[PDB]
């Protein structure tokens, strides 16, 4: 496969300000209405967050802009998206983005996400292709439009889908979805959340608590990555690609000391950075 | 996969005696029959349930049908009798016969 | 032709006994060795089979004495170590010559070795 | 499993990150030749492993004694090679009621020749022609050269020595990697030493109504003591006093 | 040059219960690399003997091969009413392979 | 288990006609495969080999017409293009295998007629 459409586009990365955001639970220990303080990797408040767009229509007619770059992992990574209609599935996290290293391949193929830690060959323009089988009338997902080779694989896992819809809501939710990715001490841990948002694009003032999903033996350093996509085929109209619109949020983590206020039920609301001002 | 034997078998010289080896559920055709003289090492009478080791007189036979394996000795003699065993075959461990003491009357 | 078994043992409960089965009269690496116990008033009991050339342990759990069989190939001996001796471990121990191939008779044995596990002294 | 391959292309399954059910292995007891190494089979229930290799194949009822770590004969010479220093167990039983079929079973194969003895644990799927004599056959068959592979002949008309064994071999190791594959009743209101999930302490365990979030493990108090823990086997909130 | 085969006789009209020896001779010394085939005219050539001295599944010992070197022998015994067909020998010693010209055993 | 052949027919001389033969039951891949010829009333004459386990192609020099042979291994199929035709090659062909003292794999196709003539 490795079908590719770079479609490079100009303009500066549109930034934003994470007000109170990216506060997960950095322990399993249940605490109630106490102020706990740790210095750990987080996304510090009032931070510069890049509102990127994987597919971006700027209207004249059509003009879908596929920009999503390979991005360094740096210290840690934060992620956020709305995507009432999912176009986002997983991420390619790795180092060489090639063989010679392992590869973190998260595919939330409906409905069983098959997390994969393997050695792949990722193409120049990787993303998940989706088509129509005509047998059983089902939309399959061609997974090798992402990567050519799959071999040597070190690890495999399956779970209930992290990406989840609700819909029926004609908006007013947008189903804002956040995922935090932190790679330490042999455990690369995943965090999640689902939130309604009525605002047009950017984030509210509310706090988002992210529980750890799975704590997995990863043992690889991931210095760079890119997201994944779900596109399809169309048929004769004046091939089809770039289903809907796609945009998401990315910011990098950083060691900071937060004071954590648990609730009577252990639901952290107020967190405060010490070094902020 | 456990085998069952009958506790004691009471017959006299010249009469034929049949001592069963009865295994729950499946059997393996092969089976191994053992003659234990009191406080003496049992000696193998029947190997494979179709053959007797060299030097073993011809009154000694073995066989099986269905879930059963018979030790069948013809023309008994007062010299011969002793407690009889079978051994299961394969199936991970071999459960040895509970044992059946052969008594011979007419003394 | 010859499996010679070490003298009888008497050991206090929970203790250990290793008994030897020495071999002669055939080719010692051409035959597996079964170890068989028989209790007071009770039947033959197979604890395990070993290999002369390698490990062969397929110990039926039965009475759990952490049993390990070792072959010393130089002397053509087979060994049986039985730990956590229990009041019902008091029984005669036979070693049994088996075929190297999947066939499994014991045609020739040792003579038996009695081990008494009793808190009472000899 | 329903379908084991032959020994020329034996299947290998790297297994880790799970728990061992070693009990029913011994409780199976329908298995012809079941031997082990490393340390005793009763001892291996808990003594556990970083990364195991479960590889299986089907061989003949006579050649299985060739399968032993450090022996000779065809299966260990050119087909499948146990190493010089080995840990695992050889598990062997008959599958005569499945494999050997009337009308003949010739699905199964093996390699009969190769120009060297086989390196340990490395299969040989290369079905090219070996040239025993010096006359080059060069891919096609001919003289001084034979075909590499051969079938077995399985029918239930075979004797007991010619019955197919589905030999599965388990091989083990130990590394800087942790034991990724590895094999007490609750007391309420009693001073009792304890361990939960490796967390250790001594306290009085009681029923408690404080309500965790699911992913959580411990509770804690103001003083960084371990105040409340959740029973892993049956989820319940247990105080520690 | 090529390896010549010599199949003799190239036909033999036979009767019930015979023991026909269909000879395939060779121009060179071939170890055992010779075969035999059943062909009723229009069928597929059903292999009878492989390596000139070994029987085949489905084919009982009414056929029986032997010979080596130059001389190879088809030992048909107790000739059956289905065995009357066109048969063939076969080298596999060198390249090119040649086959015999055929021997049609047929009802007298 | 089974071999199927491409369609035979009447072809003018000097032309070319690719021969397809697909396997079933067990693969082509691990074995070799052959072609042989039977003219009506004539003996079975070997034509050409294929050897997938390396790669090599041998032809009969008796009929040396560059009848090219190669594979479609992933379809268990084999292709020999009838090149440089001449009328005495008008015959039936078979897909073949030789038991070379090791195997018993001699499996034969159904047979299709190649015809080399200007008269259809
Ligand atoms: C993390 O992966 C990076 C590879 O991207 C490794 O960092 C490299 O380290 C060498 C020095 O040994 C530098 O010369 C390279 O420039 C580094 N890479 C980059 C991209 O800057 C590093 O080894 C890995 N982590 C660990 C703990 O080894
Ligand atoms: C964030 O970017 C703005 C420009 O959009 C710049 O003025 C500001 O200094 C930056 N701050 C940080 C912390 O990156």
Author numbering:
A (entry chain A): 14 to 251, 256 to 294
B (entry chain D): 2 to 108
C (entry chain E): 2 to 123
D (entry chain B): 344 to 526, 531 to 588
E (entry chain I): 0 to 107
F (entry chain K): 2 to 121
Sentences from the study reporting this entry:
During the establishment of SARS-CoV-2 infection, the Spike (S) protein binds to its cellular receptor, angiotensin I converting enzyme 2 (ACE2) via the receptor binding domain (RBD). Similar to other enveloped viruses (e.g., HIV), the S undergoes dramatic conformational changes from a prefusion to a postfusion state enabling fusion of viral and target cell membranes.
To decipher the molecular basis for the synergetic effect of the two-antibody cocktail, we performed cryo-EM analysis of the SARS-CoV-2 S trimer in complex with H014 and P17 Fabs. Unlike most structural studies of the apo SARS-CoV-2 S trimer or its complexes where various conformational states corresponding to 0–3 RBDs open were observed, only one conformational state with all 3 RBDs open was observed in our structure of the S in complex with the cocktail of NAbs. In total, there are 3 copies of the cocktail of NAb Fabs (3 H014 and 3 P17 Fabs) bound to one S trimer. While 3 P17 Fabs bind at the top of each RBD, overlapping and covering the contact regions of SARS-CoV-2 RBD with ACE2, forming a “cap” layer (shield-1), 3 H014 Fabs bind on the side of each RBD filling in the space between the RBD and its adjacent NTD, constructing an exterior layer (shield-2) with a staggered array beneath the cap layer. These two layers, acting as a shield, mask most of the regions of S1, preventing any possibility of the interaction of the SARS-CoV-2 RBD with host cellular receptor(s) and cell surface proteases. These structural insights explain the molecular basis for the mechanism of neutralization of SARS-CoV-2 by the cocktail of antibodies and provide a basis for rationalizing the cooperativity observed when both H014 and P17 are used for neutralizing SARS-CoV-2. The two NAbs of the cocktail can simultaneously bind to distinct regions of the RBD; one recognizing a more conserved patch across SARS-CoV and SARS-CoV-2 while the other targeting a SARS-CoV-2-specific patch, indicative of the potential of this cocktail in conferring a potent and broad protection against pan-SARS-CoV strains.
